[PDB]
């Protein structure tokens, strides 16, 4: 059964191309200046942030710059949760699950997927925003006051290392599918069914990497380790979010994100 994993992989890639607004392909063309005549507007301080909000690029009541950026981060994660939900639903084996198990997988998997996909719009100097029309510098995000700068920097560190693996969109489609269809999530109802789906995806991933990266040694075990790394990254992220909820009482959290962090 070699030709069915290809079709299984092909369905997942099509679900990926069908549902995500930004591909790594498009992201990398922009970040390297080959995308178009127009380059992204660089946000590196308060003035350029204001100019970007004023129209050159682009919420709850305004509070301060660091909280405003945080709100922008929430806008992007919520929208990526939407895309991941439709991505997962475009996978027949995911849609076959009972709706409550679908929610459990997304609840505990979306942030791991978000921070994996985030690497696609990141370089060591910053990341793309607003569909690639802007670029926020890493230095500017580091300059935000704690705890908001603390919750951002670890994702850049993971991203730069992840990008060294040089995955393409067909690799990431399978990788993200494996994150969402994870049998370890708490409160899962049909654990054996999810684990069986996960296993098929991981077989399809290995097969796909052998075909797509023939000279890439150890790439499949490396990606399994990155899946474990994302669990730790998201664990640390949830802890920092708990601290924001305790100490930044004037900062609003989107209702959907509140439900994800309900525990
Ligand atoms: O837990 C939650 O769901 C909500 C809390 C997330 C807090 C952490 O968010 C981080 C961390 C590191 C890197 C990127 C993001 C957010 N982000 C962005 O695309 C993004 C980043 C910066 C800006 C921006 C606008 C103006 C100046 O900067 C706009 C968008 C991708 C993950 C989604
Ligand atoms: C298939 C449609 C009907 C499904 C009805 C089953 C609802 O179960 C609920 O699923 C939620 C996770 O999704 C959990 O958070 C709740 O604890 C649990 O009670
Ligand atoms: C839309 C995809 C993203 C889903 C976001 C996660 C939703 O949170 C969970 O929704 C369940 C109701 O179904 C509740 O039982 C849980 O208490 C709650 O934690």
Swiss-Prot record:
Transmembrane segments: none annotated. 'Lys-48'-linked polyubiquitinated; leading to proteasomal degradation. Deubiquitinated and stabilized by OTUD3. Keywords: Activator, DNA-binding, Metal-binding, Nucleus, Receptor, Transcription, Transcription regulation, Ubl conjugation, Zinc, Zinc-finger. It is found in: Nucleus. One of its GO terms (biological process) is cellular response to hypoxia. Its main location: nucleus. Ubiquitous with maximal levels in placenta and skeletal muscle. Residues 41-263 form the NR LBD domain. It comes from the Eukaryota. GO terms for molecular function: DNA binding; DNA-binding transcription factor activity; DNA-binding transcription factor activity, RNA polymerase II-specific; DNA-binding transcription repressor activity, RNA polymerase II-specific; linoleic acid binding; lipid binding; NF-kappaB binding; nuclear receptor activity. One of its GO terms (cellular component) is nucleoplasm. Belongs to the nuclear hormone receptor family. NR1 subfamily. Ligand-activated transcription factor key mediator of energy metabolism in adipose tissues. Receptor that binds peroxisome proliferators such as hypolipidemic drugs and fatty acids. Has a preference for poly-unsaturated fatty acids, such as gamma-linoleic acid and eicosapentanoic acid. Once activated by a ligand, the receptor binds to promoter elements of target genes. Regulates the peroxisomal beta-oxidation pathway of fatty acids. Functions as transcription activator for the acyl-CoA oxidase gene. Decreases expression of NPC1L1 once activated by a ligand. Heterodimer with the retinoid X receptor. Interacts (via domain NR LBD) with CRY1 and CRY2 in a ligand-dependent manner. This is Peroxisome proliferator-activated receptor delta. The lineage of its organism: Eukaryota, Metazoa, Chordata, Craniata, Vertebrata.
């Amino acid at each position: 059964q070699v030709a069915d994993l290809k079709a299984f992989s092909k369905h997942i890639y099509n679900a990926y191309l069908k549902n995500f607004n930004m591909t790594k392909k498009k992201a990398r063309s922009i970040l390297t200046g080959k995308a178009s005549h127009t380059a992204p507007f660089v946000i590196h301080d308060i003035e350029t942030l204001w100019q970007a909000e004023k129209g050159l690029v682009w919420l709850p009541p305004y509070k301060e710059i660091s909280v405003h950026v945080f709100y922008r981060c929430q806008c992007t994660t919520v929208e990526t949760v939407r895309e991941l939900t439709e991505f997962a639903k475009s996978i027949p084996s995911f849609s076959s699950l009972f709706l409550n198990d679908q929610v459990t997988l997304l609840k505990y998997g979306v942030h791991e997927a978000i921070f994996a996909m985030l690497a696609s719009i990141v370089n060591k100097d910053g990341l793309l925003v607003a569909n690639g029309s802007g670029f926020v510098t890493r230095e500017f995000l580091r300059s935000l006051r704690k705890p908001f700068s603390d919750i951002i920097e670890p994702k850049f560190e993971f991203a730069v290392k992840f990008n060294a693996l040089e995955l393409d969109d067909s690799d990431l489609a399978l990788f993200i599918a494996a994150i969402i269809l994870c049998g370890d999530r708490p409160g899962l109802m049909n654990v054996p069914r999810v684990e069986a789906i996960q296993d098929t995806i991981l077989r399809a991933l290995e097969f796909h990497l052998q075909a797509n990266h023939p000279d890439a040694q150890y790439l499949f075990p490396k990606l399994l380790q990155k899946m474990a790394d994302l669990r730790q990254l998201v664990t640390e992220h949830a802890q920092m979010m708990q601290r924001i909820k305790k100490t930044e009482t004037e900062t609003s959290l989107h209702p959907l994100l509140q439900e994800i962090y309900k525990d």
